[PDB]
Structure formats: C-alpha cells, structure tokens
Amino acid sequence: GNAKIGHPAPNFKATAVMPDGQFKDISLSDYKGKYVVFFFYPLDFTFVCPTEIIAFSDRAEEFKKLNSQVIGASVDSHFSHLAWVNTPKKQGGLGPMNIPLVSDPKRTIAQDYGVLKADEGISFRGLFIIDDKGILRQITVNDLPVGRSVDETLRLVQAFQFTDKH
Amino acid sequence: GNAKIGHPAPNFKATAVMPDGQFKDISLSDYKGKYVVFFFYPLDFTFVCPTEIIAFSDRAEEFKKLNSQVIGASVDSHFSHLAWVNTPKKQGGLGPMNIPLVSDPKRTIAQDYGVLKADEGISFRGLFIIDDKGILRQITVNDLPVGRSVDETLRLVQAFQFTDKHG
Numbered sequence: 408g409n410a411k412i413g414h415p416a417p418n419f420k421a422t423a424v425m426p427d428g429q430f431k432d433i434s435l436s437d438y439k440g441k442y443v444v445f446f447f448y449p450l451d452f453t454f455v456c457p458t459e460i461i462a463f464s465d466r467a468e469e470f471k472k473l474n475s476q477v478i479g480a481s482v483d484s485h486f487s488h489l490a491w492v493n494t495p496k497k498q499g500g501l502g503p504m505n506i507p508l509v510s511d512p513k514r515t516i517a518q519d520y521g522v523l524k525a526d527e528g529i530s531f532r533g534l535f536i537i538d539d540k541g542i543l544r545q546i547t548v549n550d551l552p553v554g555r556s557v558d559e560t561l562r563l564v565q566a567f568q569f570t571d572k573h
Numbered sequence: 574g575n576a577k578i579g580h581p582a583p584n585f586k587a588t589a590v591m592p593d594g595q596f597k598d599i600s601l602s603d604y605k606g607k608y609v610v611f612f613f614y615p616l617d618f619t620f621v622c623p624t625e626i627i628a629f630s631d632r633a634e635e636f637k638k639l640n641s642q643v644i645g646a647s648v649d650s651h652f653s654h655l656a657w658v659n660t661p662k663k664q665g666g667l668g669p670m671n672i673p674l675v676s677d678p679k680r681t682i683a684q685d686y687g688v689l690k691a692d693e694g695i696s697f698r699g700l701f702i703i704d705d706k707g708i709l710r711q712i713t714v715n716d717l718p719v720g721r722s723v724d725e726t727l728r729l730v731q732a733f734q735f736t737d738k739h740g
C-alpha cells in the first residue's frame with residue numbers, strides 16, 4: 408500500500424457509525440491535533456476475536472487521557488456496523504461503542520494501508536498509530552486468527568508521545 | 574518490500590555473530606520446523622532502547638519452551654555486533670547473547686522486509702513472526718525511538734501456535 412513510517416498516513420474519507428449511533432462521513436485528517444489508533448478487523452459478526460473491538464471501546468478513557476482517538480474499520484457496510492452495535496453483547500453483538508467504526512466497502516482504505524487480503528476482499532488485522540501531525544509511527548499486521556492487545560497499544564502510544572517530548 | 578502475511582517470508586543468507594561469539598553464515602530457511610521471531614534494530618551502540626536486545630536474549634528460555642528461534646539484525650557489520658557483545662553491560666554493552674545477531678550491510682534484507690529507512694540506510698524497528706513452514710504471520714514496525722515488548726512477542730507466538738493446532 409502507501410503506509411510508510413515517518414510519512415503522512417494515507418488519508419481516507421468514509422461513512423462511520425459514530426459513538427452516538429448515527430452515520431457520519433469522517434476523514435482521518437479530521438483528527439489532526441490528536442494521536443490516532445486506526446485498526447482494521449476482518450468482518451462484522453465474526454466469531455474470531457470480536458471482543459478486541461469491545462476492549463478498545465471499554466478502555467476508551469485510557470486513550471482519552473493520552474489525547475488519542477481510536478477508530479475501527481472493516482470492509483462491511485455502515486448498515487452492518489449499525490446492526491452489530493445495536494445487537495446487545497448478551498446476544499453476541501458489540502453493544503454501544505465509545506469509538507467510531509469506519510466502513511471500507513470499496514476495499515480502498517485497506518489497500519492504501521497495505522492490509523487487503525486480496526483473495527478474500529477482507530482486511531487482515533492491521534493496526535496503525537498516527538501522531539497528532541498525521542505522520543505514521545507504527546504498523547501492526549496480524550494474520551486473521553490472532554487479535555491485538557489494548558495494553559500493547561497503550562504502551563506504544565505513550566512511548567511515542569514520551570519520545571515526542573524530547 | 575516483499576513481506577506479505579500468508580506468503581513465504583523473504584529468505585536471507587547472512588553472516589551472524591552466534592551465541593558462542595563466532596561468525597557463521599545462516600539462512601532463515603535453516604530454521605524451518607520452528608517459529609522464528611526475526612527483528613531489526615537500527616544501529617549497534619545505540620542509546621535508544623538497546624535494552625530490548627538484552628531482554629530478548631535474557632528471556633531466550635521462554636522462546637525455547639515455544640520451540641521458537643529469535644534472530645536480531647541490523648545493517649552494521651558482524652564485527653560491530655561482536656564488539657558490542659564483548660562490551661560489558663555496565664559500560665553500555667550487550668554482554669553475552671543467547672541469540673544470533675545478523676549483519677545486513679547491503680541493506681537488502683531490510684529492503685526485502687520493507688523496513689529500510691532509505692534516507693538513512695538503517696532499518697526501522699521491524700519485528701516479524703514466521704511459522705514453522707516459513708509463512709509470515711505477523712508484521713510489526715516501529716519508528717526508531719520505540720522498542721518492542723518481549724511479553725507481546727511471546728503472546729503472539731504462542732497464540733499463532735495455538736490457533737494453528739485448533740480453529
């Protein structure tokens with residue numbers, strides 16, 4: 408893709424399901440002034456590590472204290488995202504989210520981030536840390552079966568912010 | 574570069590400084606049959622998170638229990654690697670190593686792994702997890718100032734091994 412450490416992170420404009428439960432078209436450039444953790448997950452309604460999304464959401468406060476924004480994304484439609492959020496966790500849904508979920512139905516954001524699994528038209532489990540100036544600082548890509556750690560992501564964000572203070 | 578999840582990891586043949594302190598030419602394909610953690614660090618004698626190298630070395634036993642091999646690499650010469658190893662830790666050295674350190678002086682391995690900082694001729698802090706069949710499972714790339722966690726790396730290796738055995 409076009410994701411390079413130390414270069415501007417690839418911009419995107421996309422329909423997201425926002426924390427209030429409404430659709431909104433958002434761009435990554437809207438979040439300039441804040442650290443962004445931008446992560447991909449393969450499919451809505453997946454039985455494979457859906458709880459990572461819930462964990463990022465549940466621990467949003469810890470990212471807020473770091474003046475950082477968390478954004479999830481998959482190739483599913485904004486309507487799929489909404490359905491999943493409107494499904495209670497007791498029934499296997501996400502429930503209400505503290506983070507926006509981006510829809511990448513053209514697969515072009517995944518392609519720009521270099522995380523498209525082309526033979527399936529879904530994203531790998533990519534995660535990217537972008538600084539407050541929009542510069543890409545960290546690339547994480549897991550094969551489909553293994554999820555991400557919120558603790559590791561918080562460590563990375565802190566460490567980048569600490570080293571920025573120098 | 575050519576590192577793609579679900580595809581054979583780019584092979585390399587390179588001079589390493591081995592744990593016994595001797596040079597040896599090794600290939601990544603030598604390690605088929607084991608999980609490999611292959612990581613890059615920018616420069617020998619760096620003041621920026623050199624301790625991660627020592628941590629991977631000190632905790633080699635935990636990687637052994639996972640039947641996994643850890644290999645470090647930088648663009649510096651094998652001679653530089655050994656000098657750093659032979660520098661006492663209290664003087665800013667690595668001390669004795671339980672892992673091989675690969676030399677990538679042509680910058681071709683860094684380039685193959687997509688972690689060459691072209692404007693500088695050093696590698697970013699890349700880390701790669703390759704399975705026992707040689708297939709790349711995980712890509713990690715940090716900008717220069719931020720190091721890697723051994724605990725996170727162990728989590729990933731074991732998790733990939735567990736999910737290999739059972740969906």
Ligand SMILES: *C[C@@H](NC(=O)C(=C)NC(=O)c1csc(-c2cccnc2)n1)C(=O)OC
Pocket residue numbers: 455456457459552553554555556728731732733735736
């Ligand atoms: C969805 C969830 N899946 C797994 O964690 C999985 C298959 N994990 C493991 O096999 C595993 C081995 S050791 C380990 C661990 C995690 C956290 C703390 N200590 C050990 N997990 C996932 O990956 O979401 C994070």
